[PDB]
Scaffold this active site. Structure first.
Site, short mmCIF file in Angstrom:
data_model
loop_
_atom_site.label_atom_id
_atom_site.label_comp_id
_atom_site.label_asym_id
_atom_site.label_seq_id
_atom_site.Cartn_x
_atom_site.Cartn_y
_atom_site.Cartn_z
N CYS A 24 0.92 -1.13 0.00
CA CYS A 24 0.00 0.00 0.00
C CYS A 24 0.97 1.19 0.00
O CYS A 24 1.50 1.62 1.07
CB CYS A 24 -0.89 0.01 1.25
SG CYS A 24 -1.99 1.48 1.18
N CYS A 43 -0.33 4.24 2.13
CA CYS A 43 -0.56 4.11 3.58
C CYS A 43 -0.14 2.80 4.21
O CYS A 43 1.01 2.62 4.71
CB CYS A 43 -1.99 4.54 4.03
SG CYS A 43 -3.26 3.68 3.26
N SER A 44 -1.08 1.85 4.28
CA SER A 44 -0.77 0.59 4.96
C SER A 44 -1.79 -0.47 4.73
O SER A 44 -1.73 -1.55 5.33
CB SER A 44 -0.65 0.82 6.50
OG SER A 44 -1.89 1.46 6.98
N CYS A 45 -2.67 -0.20 3.77
CA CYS A 45 -3.78 -1.15 3.53
C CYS A 45 -3.32 -2.63 3.31
O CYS A 45 -2.31 -2.91 2.61
CB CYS A 45 -4.58 -0.67 2.36
SG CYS A 45 -4.81 1.10 2.56
CO CO Z 1 -2.84 1.63 3.34
#
Ligand code: CO
Ligand code: CO
Lengths: 226, 203, 226, 203
Positions: B107, B110-112
């Site tokens: 991601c 972000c961090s998905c």
């Molecule tokens: Co993310």
């Protein structure tokens, strides 16, 4: 926005720090920060797209080196101020109080069954973003499209590394919440969504891997036929 | 990485702890956050949801070609067959490693991460080192960081989760495992193998 | 390299901090850092392009918030290690010594007239980068060109905001030291240089100022006719 | 900008001072840096080279149309007419503000600035706030930061010094100054007016 947080393709960030193992939560404050998400979401501080936008507005130097769940705290405070639900002066006073009295009690409060039911329902039920819309998809598998060079100043999911690049539509997924409206508090305004394949040569020029491709998801307005 | 401007880790933790306790006190007074809500979320992702769930999916796909077909067609619906699903996995798409293609997920924004099958992501996945580099030098990153050498002739496909589609890698079944039980096969399936940063365990 | 330091068009960096006045040097250490440039340049640590590349390799979080002349110190140490002229262990020991004994003397040394002459000559004479080359210019005023999407991992002067964008050649300046070789220690390899005009719509899409253009300088290999 | 990770200014200065003194001790022992070299550089840019030099150039261009022509054709050569020139001004190009066009200069990649006519740049020019924003929202930045409102119909041209060409703005001559002396006109010319962030002083 063209924030530093959109880090795909940035050079110079250094080697990965990966300990051989790690706990899910490194400290009790991270469990608090994590659980504050359903709490503030239920309370109307923000939806998911708006939560991401609050993080993107962080001081980039703080973003790059802070503990991850600190980003979550910044976005709750951002949206708490935005909506008038958090008073910053009161927050500042309480911070100093707990700096000086770290073992002081939390406020007396009642537990609430409805919050436990809300959490279990979210976790196991999900919060689906797919939506039905009136119009059919504009694009289809095999279409060759160019990604927009628009540069909104609010929230969007337009990584700088893909803008103006040409790729091929791989899949149409149906329509979903559109971040460029939802993350800016302008509502769901759902748009069809596609995965698009970009070669590493298209993205990076001759410094790209010669045998690699990146798949990136594009809402309909992000792409047009070449 | 060295930053002459940065406080010690201990000073940073001390400041964050106070800030968090302050914000917590306010949300508690609003009636929107409670100690049992906090404890429940932490129990679910410490002990209920994690990569053992993805491992069950992988091994079923390895030992059941019709399920594998369903899993690659619609990952959410397939995983619901095993009672697996929910938050941040509402739209899963699984992608299959083969002798010709190797997949890795990221991601970049972000961090998905596919929470219902992997639980929450490890810190290195959410950090900017991995996120920045994997879309640009995936072959070098897999070698240097993970000891995983993908020959130049094999295509590496990097999936950047910019939407709520959550990509999960079905790793190739290790050689030497013919006719193993689902339980034996599961010992080979790691979170890293479903992110695409390592293959499933040899032997 | 795709470093964070290439900040044109980045959003979220916050308002300008501009005090009503300021001294040229805020502290004695900045005068030292500043004068270390001719000193290390004369000594062969780095040329100008290589100096810039050392700064670009900084930790971006340190870059964004450190005092400017601290960037200069990082690049001298980078090049001192690269060339084997600075021992990092000795530097680390000396740092702690001057942490604990801030008013300890500097080492005894002789003054050198040739260093004063070098500084006055650089300042008033200049260090011109223009060079003559064998080939004539490839491009000319009015030519419409697209900027390369190459993404070298070493030094270059290829701001991410201009890559793949189309602009018009405004002026040819002659040839100059080429950064993509010089900053990577691969020598001057001079290339013709042009100013190119890009509209704000081309650079930013519909979020661009409708009545604005950016002029950016491009070495010949950076551009081709559309 | 608030950064909960960052040391105090006093701690940062204390650490930088030690680091610099250490590196200084090493370069001194190498025979490559001396106290008189350091003092000389600081004297030149505290007191010898600075925007009073650019102001002389501007006022000559305002009161001498043939010089102005030469200055816009080849800024280095024109400035040498006044004995002005040297390091980081070896290739100057001056650009003329008019009723139709307003110019502003920036070094988005670092801090490049026309040193022989302006001396060293102020800190805000070298910092990422100005550098990032001026190529993307120049009209808003000039209004918000500098109180300078450029009407929407007037083109703003931003010059990014990516090469050793050093751009300098010739600001428009303020109304009300007909027949003033070169010395009187100079009181109106500021560094900001030659960067393009403000007009020359009214009155
Ligand atoms: Co993310
Ligand atoms: Co510069």
């Amino acid at each position: 926005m063209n924030g530093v947080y959109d880090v795909g393709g940035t050079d110079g960030l250094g080697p990965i720090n990966r300990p051989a193992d790690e706990p899910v939560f490194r400290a009790e404050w991270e469990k608090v920060a994590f659980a504050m998400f359903p709490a503030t979401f239920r309370a109307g501080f923000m939806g998911l797209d708006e939560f991401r936008f609050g993080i993107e507005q962080m001081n980039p130097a703080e973003y790059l080196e802070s503990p991850y769940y600190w980003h979550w705290i910044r976005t709750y405070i951002h949206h708490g101020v935005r909506t008038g639900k958090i008073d910053l002066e009161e927050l500042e006073r309480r911070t100093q109080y707990y700096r000086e009295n770290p073992d002081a009690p939390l406020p007396e409060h009642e537990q609430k069954p409805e919050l436990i039911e809300f959490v279990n329902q979210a976790v196991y039920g999900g919060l689906p973003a797919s939506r039905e819309v009136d119009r059919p998809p504009k694009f289809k598998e095999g279409d060759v499209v160019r990604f927009s060079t628009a540069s909104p100043k609010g929230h969007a999911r337009r990584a700088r590394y893909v803008r103006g690049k040409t790729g091929t539509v791989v899949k149409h997924h149906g329509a979903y919440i559109y971040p460029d409206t939802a993350g800016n508090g302008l509502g769901e305004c759902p748009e069809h969504l596609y995965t698009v394949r970009f070669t590493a040569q298209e993205l990076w020029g001759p410094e790209g891997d010669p045998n690699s491709s990146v798949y990136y998801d594009c809402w309909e307005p992000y792409i047009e036929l070449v | 990485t060295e930053n002459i401007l940065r406080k010690s880790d201990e000073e940073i933790q001390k400041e964050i702890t106070a800030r968090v306790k302050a914000l917590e006190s306010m949300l508690i007074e609003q009636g929107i956050l409670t100690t049992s809500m906090i404890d429940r979320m932490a129990e679910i992702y410490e002990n209920e949801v994690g990569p053992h769930l993805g491992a069950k999916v992988v091994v079923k796909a390895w030992t059941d070609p019709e399920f594998k077909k369903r899993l690659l067609a619609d990952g959410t619906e397939a995983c619901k067959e095993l009672g697996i699903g929910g938050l941040q996995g509402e739209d899963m798409m699984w992608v299959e490693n083969t002798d010709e293609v190797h997949h890795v997920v990221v991601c970049t924004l972000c961090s998905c991460y596919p929470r219902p099958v992997l639980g929450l992501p490890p810190n290195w996945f959410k950090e900017p080192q991995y996120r920045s580099r994997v879309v640009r030098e995936p072959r070098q990153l897999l070698k240097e960081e993970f000891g995983f050498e993908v020959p130049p002739s094999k295509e590496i496909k990097v999936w950047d989760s910019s939407s709520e589609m959550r990509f999960v890698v079905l790793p190739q079944r290790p050689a030497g495992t013919d006719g193993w039980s689902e339980e034996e096969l599961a010992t080979l399936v790691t979170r890293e193998s479903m992110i695409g940063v390592e293959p499933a365990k040899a032997v």
